[PDB]
């Protein structure tokens, strides 16, 4: 029926409705650190989020998205392996039912408790909907979360989750600064891949940061309280909303560091 993360509609079944699921440039992947090529021609990333305007937080039934005003160049990513400017449209997370799983990308097969994705679209395409149809349409920053100390900048998000508990609920969410979600270092790995949920389009330049951020146990515990279902439907906790690692195929992972 419609895709999700259960036993009957889970990632193993997606190919039946989205044949691109078995494509040549599918994400996520395992990052083999000893095989990644250091590329000294990669520039440092440029993150300009000082003019970011968050607007709303929504439970879409598969994750929660915080959405930003992308009608102008307010929060952009450039540099790194990118050509052109990419505007932040939304961020969301992937997490697990236990601390030992939850991330989509893995490092030398190590899984993290969660993974943050900051989604940006290439301005040359005029809108998000046009950008997903292009090989260089999106740039996604992936950030791993490990359980340790609390991340102060994530608490505003944690606190509003009670109000978007079930699918379709949304809440006003203004004045949130995504700078509070970045690690100290911007060292990264990069490769060409896709969206990790249907429609699985192969339009993404992935930028995965080497340094994880820490969250407390209680912070991630609040994520696990969300629901996949709509209000008044039987309760299914929103956990394990992560796609397993896909074959690298003909692709090289490049590192911005050695
Ligand atoms: Zn994602």
From Swiss-Prot:
Effect recorded for residue 196 to S/V: Reduced activity
Cellular component terms (Gene Ontology): apical part of cell; cytoplasm; cytosol; extracellular exosome; myelin sheath; plasma membrane
Domain Alpha-carbonic anhydrase: start-end pairs: 1-257
Domain of life: Eukaryota
Outcome of substituting residue 60 to D: Strongly reduced activity
Description of pH dependence: Optimum pH is 6-8.
SMART domains according to UniProt: Carb_anhydrase
Places the protein is found: Cytoplasm; Cell membrane
Outcome recorded upon mutating residue 142 to R: In OPTB3; complete loss of activity
Site (Involved in the binding of some activators, including histamine and L-histidine): 90
Effect of residue 197 to H: Higher affinity for bicarbonate. Enhanced proton transfer capacity
SUPFAM superfamilies reported for this sequence: Carbonic anhydrase
KW Lyase (keyword) present: yes
Modification type Phosphoserine: residues: 163, 170
Presence of the UniProt keyword Membrane in the record: yes
Keyword annotations: Acetylation, Cell membrane, Cytoplasm, Disease variant, Lyase, Membrane, Metal-binding, Osteopetrosis, Phosphoprotein, Zinc
Pfam families the record matches: Carb_anhydrase
Record-listed substrate binding positions: 196-197
GO biological process: angiotensin-activated signaling pathway; carbon dioxide transport; morphogenesis of an epithelium; neuron cellular homeostasis; positive regulation of cellular pH reduction; positive regulation of dipeptide transmembrane transport; positive regulation of synaptic transmission, GABAergic; regulation of chloride transport
Variant or mutagenesis effect after changing residue 104 to D: Normal CO(2) hydrase activity
Known outcome of mutating residue 90 to P: In OPTB3; in Czechoslovakia
Residues marked Fine-tunes the proton-transfer properties of H-64 (site): 5, 60, 65
Coiled coil: none
Record's protein name: Carbonic anhydrase 2
Species of the source: Homo sapiens (Human)
């Amino acid at each position: 029926h419609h895709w999700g993360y259960g036993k009957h509609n889970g990632p193993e079944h997606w190919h039946k409705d989205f044949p691109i699921a078995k494509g040549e440039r599918q994400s996520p992947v395992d990052i083999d650190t000893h095989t990644a090529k250091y590329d000294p021609s990669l520039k440092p990333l440029s993150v300009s989020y000082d003019q970011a305007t968050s607007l709303r937080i929504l439970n879409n039934g598969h994750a929660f998205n915080v959405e930003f005003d992308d009608s102008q160049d307010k929060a952009v990513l450039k540099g790194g392996p990118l050509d052109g400017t990419y505007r932040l449209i939304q961020f969301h997370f992937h997490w697990g039912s236990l601390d030992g799983q939850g991330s989509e990308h893995t490092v030398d097969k190590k899984k993290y408790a969660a993974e943050l994705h900051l989604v940006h679209w290439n301005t040359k395409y005029g809108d998000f909907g046009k950008a997903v149809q292009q090989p260089d349409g999106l740039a996604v920053l992936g950030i791993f979360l490990k359980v340790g100390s609390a991340k102060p900048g994530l608490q505003k998000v944690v606190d509003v989750l009670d109000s978007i508990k079930t699918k379709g609920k949304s809440a006003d969410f203004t004045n949130f600064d995504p700078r509070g979600l970045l690690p100290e270092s911007l060292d990264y790995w990069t490769y060409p891949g896709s969206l990790t949920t249907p429609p699985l389009l192969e339009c993404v330049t992935w930028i995965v940061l080497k340094e994880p951020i820490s969250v407390s146990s209680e912070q991630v515990l609040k994520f696990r309280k969300l629901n996949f279902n709509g209000e008044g439907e039987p309760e299914e906790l929103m956990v394990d909303n992560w796609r397993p690692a896909q074959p690298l195929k003909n692709r090289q992972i490049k590192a911005s560091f050695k």
